[PDB]
Amino acid sequence: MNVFNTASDEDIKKGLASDVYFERTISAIGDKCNDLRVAMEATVSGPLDTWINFTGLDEVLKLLEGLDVDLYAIPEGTILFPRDANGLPVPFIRVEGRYCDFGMYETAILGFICQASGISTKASKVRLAAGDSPFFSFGIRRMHPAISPMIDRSAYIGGADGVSGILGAKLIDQDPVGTMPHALSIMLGDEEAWKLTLENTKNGQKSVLLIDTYMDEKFAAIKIAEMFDKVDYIRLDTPSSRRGNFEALIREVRWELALRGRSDIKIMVSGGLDENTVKKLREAGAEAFGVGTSISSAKPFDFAMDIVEVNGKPETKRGKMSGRKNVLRCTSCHRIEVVPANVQEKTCICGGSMQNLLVKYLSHGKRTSEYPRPKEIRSRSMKELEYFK
Amino acid sequence: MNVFNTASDEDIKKGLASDVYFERTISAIGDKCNDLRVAMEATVSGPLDTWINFTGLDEVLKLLEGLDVDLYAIPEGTILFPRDANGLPVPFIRVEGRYCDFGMYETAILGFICQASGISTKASKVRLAAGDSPFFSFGIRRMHPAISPMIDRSAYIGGADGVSGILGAKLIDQDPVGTMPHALSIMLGDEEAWKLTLENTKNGQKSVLLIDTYMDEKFAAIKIAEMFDKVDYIRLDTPSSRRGNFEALIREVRWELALRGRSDIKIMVSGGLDENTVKKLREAGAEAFGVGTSISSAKPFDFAMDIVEVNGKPETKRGKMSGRKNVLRCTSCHRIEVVPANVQEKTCICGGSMQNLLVKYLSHGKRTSEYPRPKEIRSRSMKELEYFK
Amino acid sequence: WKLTLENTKNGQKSVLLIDTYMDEKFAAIKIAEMFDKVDYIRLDTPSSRRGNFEALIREVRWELALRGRSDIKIMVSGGLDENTVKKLREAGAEAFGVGT
Amino acid sequence: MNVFNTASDEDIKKGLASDVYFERTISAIGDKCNDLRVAMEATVSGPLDTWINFTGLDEVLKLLEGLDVDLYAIPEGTILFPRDANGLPVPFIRVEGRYCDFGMYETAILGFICQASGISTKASKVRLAAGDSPFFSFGIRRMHPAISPMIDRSAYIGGADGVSGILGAKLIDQDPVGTMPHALSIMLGDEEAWKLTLENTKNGQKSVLLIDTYMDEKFAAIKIAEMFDKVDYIRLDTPSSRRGNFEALIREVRWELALRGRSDIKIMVSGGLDENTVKKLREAGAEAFGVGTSISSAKPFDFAMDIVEVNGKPETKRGKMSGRKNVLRCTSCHRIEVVPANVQEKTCICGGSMQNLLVKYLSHGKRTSEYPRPKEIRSRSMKELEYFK
Ligand SMILES: O=P(O)(O)OC[C@H]1C[C@H](OP(=O)(O)OP(=O)(O)O)[C@H](O)[C@@H]1O
Ligand SMILES: O=P(O)(O)OC[C@H]1C[C@H](OP(=O)(O)OP(=O)(O)O)[C@H](O)[C@@H]1O
Ligand SMILES: O=P(O)(O)OC[C@H]1C[C@H](OP(=O)(O)OP(=O)(O)O)[C@H](O)[C@@H]1O
Ligand SMILES: O=P(O)(O)OC[C@H]1C[C@H](OP(=O)(O)OP(=O)(O)O)[C@H](O)[C@@H]1O
């Protein structure tokens, strides 16, 4: 109950950020609440035609910490498919305890991993397409500001080299990235805007000039070459109506610059980009990318949380598989097999042994380890992404 | 800088929930900041093959209130296309003042109207498809909890009769909606779960029994008919793997019940529904719908904010149209024409006059009127939706 | 443009090719504030620059009207069909150059 | 200004075969005409999803010869893509001189290389499909007679073994090809027509009998086998309405003939054929092909001519790349790189060096060499086609 239409940390920790049916149900359970011990696993019902970059667990731990519950989960930054080598739904997190003790957090728990995972996953796809070239997350403006930090966080972990959001950058412990806007050229004109921008580019940072405000990207690039020398990048946000063939335009520009002996001036692009768009433009000559919407508004994975066991006995509903289970992965080929919890390791043909990926993060509500910082996590994520081409 | 990865009301009001390039630019503008008066209009670059249910302005006013800026906008709950009768981009909100005075809020302003509008718009499409039958917003679990209230808000305004979120319901001033979950049947069994659920259904509320936990929807429905009498609804969340032909199953169930003289038992459905899904199931016999994901994770409209005027003179970049402008609509056929601000009304062939829709909400940072409550807004929205079949 | 206007004769309408160097939009504004008796503005916009020709024509027509020059008609050419011509005429074009 | 609606050699040399805007413009340039030295290169805007067999330069030289202009160009019969290994538009001909001196010839210059190149290119595709079997150009009847010779010329150079046009054949210095028409059978009947045709087949030429006039190709073939002995070919122009499955019919015919010990009688086909049609029929058993329309009316490449330099300084418009340039090709793999004129050779990975393909054909209006005859050119063309499967 704050200024904007949002739930505060307090609200979500109090369980006010959830569906009423939960508390109403717990209430209905009454005295029986004490003798109701369950284990619930979270699986992906959502898109199965893609792998996923798991992200958002950090938020889950911050919420369940303190409650008398054991919590297992796959570490953020891991990349794998929603179904194992044999089509078994893979459980990303498991929670054990009194149903009534944490049941009202289903809503929040899902929310913390659904949207985030979609975001980190899209960034990963974009990462693969950007290759050795850098791309940055510029999409918070597309979503509610209240969640601007988690977006950049997942984007970063997903593979984004940098991030534009102030708070998101703070969260990942990196300096925000940002270039002069069109606004500047509209108010002061290109010449004065570029001068101001070059004069104000500081530290170990590269100068970048926005050139599609008024002129034709081609002639704007020439004008800049003959007007300034120390300019690292030329950024193009070319209006879609002007974007007849972006690839061709980038080439035209690159040739014109080389002709004037300025092949040193790199080219950056932004505005409505994908893994697809990014890949084709990088092949055209682009070396820096600004990616937003496609990542920030990435569709969320449809995670579901279900009781898979009741007071030690396997129990579920139709469409779900009962029993607590582990997620074994080949330390070599990364083959994955979902198995019953009473199986820790297994022999993986080709490579070696399959060890469990599901790690215990909470024990009786207490953190079993120190949670990794974002940079550490995206570090894992990139090694992880290496296995997907 | 709070517990979860979110920006607090304080953070966003301080402008910490934005791209660094803004402050960095303002800073670069320096002394010139005082003599830089601009007017920026917000237009939809996003999906143009659809109309839109504008929503989120409330958040914008709560943010800009206090600043020396005049603000015009189309009222939330209005429904129209992103381009006028002649393909001119329609401006949904206009802001006038010193660029440096509010420039850092571009990020937040967009975020407040992009995601929300997508949500309210999808709910509207779902509304049209539900007809006289009720549908509720059950999708917050799919997104970050921090924004669970704004989601239900837009969903409600979009046409949802009810909402499941606790905070969202508080915000719209309506009681949250919710039915017994599968969890209850897994822990206590159907028989005991249905009894508990019927015993705990109170007030002017209708009883609803979740029947797809263990049995076949068909036989579960029969068992319920011969077991209880006062049961208003039968809810089916049938697992997709069991959903061979949902329509056919609903019919099978409805016939079986009628045969046993229980045609009074209505049928509710939920789980992966659209305007499409909802329409076909309503034709099959469903009378109540639970809709989530499709609405809560609805793609956002790609709003852009651009300077359209500088110190009284028309000014913009390529791909944008300069000058402050009004949005005139036929009070009859609702034909829309974007025109230069110096045109208040116009004659609309067929019907009568075209009046301006862009209303001044803030004058020098002060609210020019009392903002409508959600119910009032969705009331407008439904009259508005009436014009679209 | 000066040469072209100076050499337009007889019962003929002046037409200025504006997509050589600038952005059609700003080139149109520059022309409005620079010359008065100009009957047409011709756009042969390179395909690589033709992201959405229809939208560009509109942008241009609005900009000109804003400056009270709605009298300046718009002509188009370059890779046109019955299809292309029909959609551009609906966008605002009033003269077409059709070849290939 | 002659009998038919055509421009005579005189008319085109006088520049009457062009758009008025040229002379009108030159005139407008006036006194400035003397100090306007430009270099214009011709590039393909046209179809880029295919390689091209350049043809028509011969006509260009015959027109520009005499004028004070230097002219470089890729030799006719060369085959390559419109864009180099890196997507740079490839210039096929360059002209240097006073703009006013030759500017009015843009129209004609393009016309000479646009239509022709399309024709030679299609013939090349047909060549590849005909394999070691011969195909002839029979399509002049589809286009205006005034240009019947240039059509056969390009068709020949493209790979056609022979040509039907009288003048075109004269131009390539080969005897025209031609078989008895249906007309003969309609006027005299098959029996008398075939006799006449066999009696009048002379020199080192093969007898060919048109058999689809009256009978069923199958029985007509049998009748011919048992009626004549020295018959080299059986030609089928089967009406499309009778062409249920041409491939199957050819087989039926070939079997019937073999059964009667006449497998020596080869089969020729014609009428609405492509690279596709030709390939499938050759696999069915056809050994000779008559191809017209598809080649004679082949779509033209959309060549454009643009000033790429003005008085020694690089200059162009948007969408074009400035500066005079060379077209380097790997003498091995035939990799192509468009480069600035000040680069003659380059090292081509894999194979060896890349030499320039753009050759100087005119120097101050004077031929720098003796132009190759058609046969010589198509000889080059076939070696050239060898690199494309
Ligand atoms: O999140 P980003 O990747 O930065 O892009 C978000 C918007 C903006 C950009 O268009 P605009 O520049 O707003 O205009 P237009 O659609 O005309 O190209 C792009 O086409 C997307 O629709
Ligand atoms: O937001 P909602 O409309 O409620 O639905 C969100 C999820 C859940 C439901 O599937 P599950 O019941 O989780 O399982 P399954 O996919 O197997 O049907 C549906 O198919 C969507 O994927
Ligand atoms: O016969 P017309 O209708 O006049 O047009 C013929 C060519 C030229 C024009 O392109 P260019 O201006 O040559 O270049 P681009 O293809 O890059 O647009 C058009 O796209 C056609 O391909
Ligand atoms: O240039 P050519 O390859 O020789 O073909 C040109 C025409 C003639 C032939 O049909 P006809 O024999 O005129 O009649 P039909 O279409 O009925 O087969 C073929 O189908 C093409 O349409």
UniProtKB/Swiss-Prot annotation, chains A, B, D:
GO MF annotation: an example: metal ion binding
Pfam families recorded: QRPTase_C (PF01729), QRPTase_N (PF02749)
Binding site for Zn(2+) 1: 330, 333, 350
Modifications after synthesis and translation: Transiently phosphorylated on a His residue during the reaction cycle. Phosphorylation strongly increases the affinity for substrates and increases the rate of nicotinate D-ribonucleotide production. Dephosphorylation regenerates the low-affinity form of the enzyme, leading to product release.
Residues engaged in binding nicotinate: 21, 138, 179, 235
Binding site for 5-phospho-alpha-D-ribose 1-diphosphate: 240, 272, 293
Record's keyword terms, sorted: Ligase, Metal-binding, Nucleotide-binding, Phosphoprotein, Pyridine nucleotide biosynthesis, Transferase, Zinc
Phosphohistidine found at: 182
Stored CDD domains: NAPRTase_B
Residue sites binding Zn(2+) 2 per the record: 330, 348, 350
Family: Belongs to the NAPRTase family. Highly divergent.
Role, per record: Catalyzes the synthesis of beta-nicotinate D-ribonucleotide from nicotinate and 5-phospho-D-ribose 1-phosphate at the expense of ATP.
Record text about domains: Consists of three domains, an N-terminal domain, a central functional domain, and a unique C-terminal domain containing a zinc knuckle-like motif containing 4 cysteines.
Protein name per the record: Putative nicotinate phosphoribosyltransferase
